[PDB]
Design a binder for this molecule. Structure first.
Ligand SMILES: Cc1cc2nc3c(=O)[nH]c(=O)nc-3n(C[C@H](O)[C@H](O)[C@H](O)COP(=O)(O)OP(=O)(O)OC[C@H]3O[C@@H](n4cnc5c(N)ncnc54)[C@H](O)[C@@H]3O)c2cc1C
Length: 524
């Protein structure tokens, strides 16, 4: 056996997994990533305007109190270069890179039932054995594309936001962006003032609220650092872990004037989860409440965008649901003389040619640069790109052919000694706290197994199915089921997130570890 544990991924999840298993459990560990450096999604996504949804002081690890006191809190939210710099400092400080093998994709992982360990094979045909396999593959996968006809004929710059190259310049160029979601809102806002002309190809108009990303004073920062213990206690006692005052107030239980005041206060403070969950307690649950949130944003759109026909084209016709978006000046962009909005739901893209995007009306939109601002695949995307075989050689893709599943978001029946970080049916909450929660639970179970000579840990089918039912029962009280959210698993009816909150999740998994790991088979 080469290692006690093998870790796939060197983002937030894989890095803390390595720290806990190597330095706290004193195990022999190796992590692998295709990336050339740590950071995960913050290494891969380097597009213009990439920015956290979580406020800076909470989008980080909490377990190293020296790091908390040391860390840079430059603005209220944190840019992609600065998240990457942070994670590199973590790897510096805890000497992680010597046990990470970079530029190394994992092709397959086959469980050896005779030896109760995993046979792991890299894409360069290196074989490694390890008792435990930690799959820290992240909650999102890159989504490829149904090829637009003729895309291969385009002779200008063709950039995908999931593989954004260095050295891109914008001045003097006609630029187009396909995609107006999470990523597209950030890219469009960042580049509109830099290009000669911007054409935005909008397939679905989405809601977005201001992010309110401001510089943090030394005073601001000192008071956060003085109160950090209480700040994290509030995280662990919350549903979402975003530092919000999570509301229980029903939207329709106050007057129209008081409702507008509450929305306006959130709009001015900024933040997508703030607008959706600090204002009232039923926006994601009650359609009448949700329409109030919709209308507030639609009214802001009509006030910001002066041309009422442009404002109409930007105005959504859907539920205010899915992961809430925020922006640094998105609707304002459409007042610019050098910006054109194309509704490609009404006027679809039908072809790309050597110098243009062609819409169904026959119009050739001439471009020097075309940007595909893509969405993301759900969690199981990264898993079916690895040939993972468990008991009886059944693959993870086959085991999940009828929909992904898990016990607690961390274990899959028929896949012993494998632990997922951010696997299917993990809570919806701020990611670093979820990740620390899961990594610490896995390490407690693994350290337990080492102390009790147990060498095969497996969730039962009944435990997996009960968790699917638990998640289904919560998720179907909400509008997220009805809203068809790609990042929650609508393209895999079902929402593959535990939506009972971080505090309740930590109660659920602590009950399991406290009751002799019920739902798990512990074998010697
Ligand atoms: C632009 C953007 C902004 C975000 N902002 C927020 C935010 O504000 N708040 C929040 O809570 N979440 C946010 N997220 C969600 C984000 O996924 C998490 O916060 C967190 O970064 C996930 O870390 P991870 O280590 O779990 O996964 P990742 O960072 O995705 O790391 C997974 C790693 O696994 C590697 N890997 C996968 N398959 C293989 C293989 N076969 N072989 C080798 N390596 C492999 C990948 O290369 C990747 O580096 C954001 C995501 C994006 C894309």
């Amino acid at each position: 056996m080469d290692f006690d544990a093998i870790i796939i991924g060197a983002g937030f999840g894989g890095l803390y997994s390595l720290k806990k298993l190597r330095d706290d459990l004193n195990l022999k560990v190796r992590a692998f990533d295709r990336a050339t450096e740590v950071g995960g999604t913050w290494f891969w996504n380097q597009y213009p305007g990439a920015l956290s949804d979580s406020e800076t002081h909470l989008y980080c690890y909490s377990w190293d109190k020296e790091l908390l006191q040391e860390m840079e809190i430059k603005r209220k939210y944190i840019s992609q270069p600065d998240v990457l710099a942070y994670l590199k400092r973590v790897a510096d400080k805890h000497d992680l890179r010597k046990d990470i093998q970079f530029e190394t994709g994992i092709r397959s992982a086959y469980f050896d039932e005779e030896n109760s360990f995993w046979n792991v094979t890299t894409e360069n045909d290196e074989k490694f054995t390890a008792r435990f396999l930690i799959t820290a593959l992240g909650p999102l996968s890159a989504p490829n594309l149904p090829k637009i006809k003729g895309i291969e004929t385009f002779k200008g710059e063709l950039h995908h936001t999931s593989r954004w190259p260095k050295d891109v310049t914008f001045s003097g160029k006609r630029v187009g962006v396909i995609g107006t979601g999470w990523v597209g809102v950030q890219v469009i806002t960042a580049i509109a003032s830099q290009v000669k002309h911007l054409t935005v190809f909008q397939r679905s108009a989405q809601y977005s609220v201001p992010i309110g990303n401001v510089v943090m004073s030394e005073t601001d920062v000192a008071k956060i650092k003085e109160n950090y213990d209480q700040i994290w206690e509030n995280v662990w006692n919350s549903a979402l872990g975003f530092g919000l005052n999570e509301s229980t107030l029903p939207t329709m239980s106050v007057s129209a004037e008081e409702r507008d005041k509450i929305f306006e206060e959130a709009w001015q403070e900024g933040g997508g989860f703030r607008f959706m969950f600090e204002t009232f307690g039923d926006i994601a649950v009650d359609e009448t409440a949700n329409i109030e949130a919709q209308n507030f944003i639609k009214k802001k759109i009509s006030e910001i965008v002066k041309d009422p026909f442009v404002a109409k084209k930007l105005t959504p016709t859907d539920l205010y649901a899915c992961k809430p978006l925020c922006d640094s000046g998105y609707y304002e962009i459409f007042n610019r003389d050098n910006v054109s909005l194309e509704d490609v739901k009404a006027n679809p893209i039908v072809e790309i040619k050597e110098d243009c995007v062609v819409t169904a009306d026959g119009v050739e939109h001439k471009l020097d640069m075309l940007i595909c601002a893509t969405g993301f695949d759900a969690v199981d995307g990264s898993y079916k790109r690895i040939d993972i075989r468990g008991k009886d050689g059944i693959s993870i893709k086959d085991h999940w052919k009828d929909g992904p599943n898990s016990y607690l978001g961390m274990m899959v029946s028929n896949f012993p000694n494998m632990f997922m970080v951010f696997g299917p049916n993990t809570p919806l909450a701020n990611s670093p706290p979820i990740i620390e929660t899961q990594v610490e639970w896995i390490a407690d179970l693994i350290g337990y197994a080492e102390d009790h000579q147990i060498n095969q840990i497996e969730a039962t089918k009944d435990a997996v199915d009960n968790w699917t039912n638990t998640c289904s029962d919560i998720a179907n009280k909400t509008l997220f089921a009805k809203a068809k959210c790609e990042e929650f698993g609508a393209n895999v009816n079902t929402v593959y997130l535990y939506m009972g909150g971080l505090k309740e999740y930590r109660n659920q998994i602590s009950e399991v570890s406290n009751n002799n790991y019920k739902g798990c088979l512990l074998k010697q």
